[PDB]
């Protein structure tokens, strides 16, 4: 099993860990901030997914410094993760294209 597939697998596991830790820590950052909506675990988890995929729905977002710090890590993990799957598919196609010219 090639590096690029191990890495994509790793990045998926690591992103799901980031989405759960992020759920938990967003609620922990945002409770105590009057007006905050990112304060129960289930919608925190939905929030973490729409943040990682950079969907920017705009139904939920953090209003505190530590919530926003948590948000930044989730976004970076999401963009890296999905970038790494792209790199992995590039490698696969470059390989399949070497072979298809008998290199």
């Amino acid at each position: 099993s090639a590096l690029h597939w191990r890495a994509a697998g790793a990045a998926t596991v690591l992103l799901v860990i980031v989405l759960l830790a992020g759920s938990y820590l967003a609620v922990l950052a945002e409770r105590g901030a009057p007006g905050a909506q990112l304060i129960t675990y289930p919608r925190a988890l939905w929030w973490s997914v729409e943040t990682a995929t950079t969907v920017g729905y705009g139904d939920l977002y953090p209003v505190t410094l530590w919530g926003r710090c948590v948000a930044v890590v989730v976004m970076v993990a999401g963009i890296t993760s999905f970038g790494l799957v792209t790199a992995a598919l590039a490698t696969w196609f470059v390989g399949r294209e070497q072979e298809r010219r008998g290199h």
Partner: antibody
Framework: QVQLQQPGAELVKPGASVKLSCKAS????????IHWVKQRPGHGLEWIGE????????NYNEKIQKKATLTADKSSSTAFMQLSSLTSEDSAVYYC???????????WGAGTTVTVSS | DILLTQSPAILSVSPGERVSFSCRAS??????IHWYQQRTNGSPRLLIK???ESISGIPSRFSGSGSGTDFTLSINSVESEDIANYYC?????????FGSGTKLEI
């Protein structure tokens, strides 16, 4: 089972403080928040504050004079509320309740009647 | 902070009749409203969560409806054991807040 056990009563001299206890049983999660709610006789429910025992962070009602300090003992599954410098304004039933981090008080203690009097 | 208005304070009904308790939020809170029953000398008891969801242990007689700002807890065919104060509570925005309460009177 009784999920939340509170002492029936505390008498407190005016000016003095008191620690209320709240010993939890049944399922405990990392996610669990313990809340405290004040009810004066013939009056409604007043949210005082919350603590997350797994991390020990606490938040308080801004809109009222801060009387309370919340702590928890991870090992003995007990949450504490230190009410300090009481007056007759502070005479009330104090409920503890458990929230699974999903927004609603699944279960309440039976409440501690706190009387401030000489 | 979200204000929950429960008007009227007292609701009189005859036995076996249907009754509706109102809860109005000062801004939209979707379906993040939960309802408690508190009998004389008793602690609160969760009846309905997220505006409409059953709790096991609660008579089918109880139901909830509403979204946004206007929420209703209903009892089809009231009976004596329903005599209590009924409170609403929001979990949309920090901090959680309670309605001032409505007494049912038969």
């Amino acid at each position: 089972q009784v999920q939340l056990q509170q002492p029936g009563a505390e008498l407190v001299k005016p000016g003095a403080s008191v620690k209320l206890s709240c010993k939890a049983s049944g399922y405990t999660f990392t996610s669990d928040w313990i809340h405290w709610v004040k009810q004066r006789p013939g009056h409604g429910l007043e949210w005082i504050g919350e603590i997350i025992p797994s991390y020990g962070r606490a938040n308080y009602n801004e809109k009222i004079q801060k009387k309370a300090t919340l702590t928890a003992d991870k090992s003995s599954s007990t949450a504490f509320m230190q009410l300090s410098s009481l007056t007759s304004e502070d005479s009330a039933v104090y409920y503890c309740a458990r929230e699974r981090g999903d927004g609603y008080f699944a279960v309440w203690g039976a409440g501690t009647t706190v009387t401030v009097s000489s | 902070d979200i204000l929950l208005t429960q008007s009227p304070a007292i609701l009189s009904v005859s036995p076996g009749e249907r009754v509706s308790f109102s809860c109005r939020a000062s801004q939209s809170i979707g379906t993040d409203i939960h309802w408690y029953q508190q009998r004389t000398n008793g602690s609160p008891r969760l009846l309905i969560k997220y505006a409409s969801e059953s709790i096991s242990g609660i008579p089918s007689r109880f139901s909830g409806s509403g979204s946004g700002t206007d929420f209703t807890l209903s009892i089809n065919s009231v009976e004596s054991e329903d005599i209590a104060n009924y409170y609403c509570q929001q979990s949309n925005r920090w901090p959680f807040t309670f309605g001032s309460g409505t007494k049912l009177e038969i």
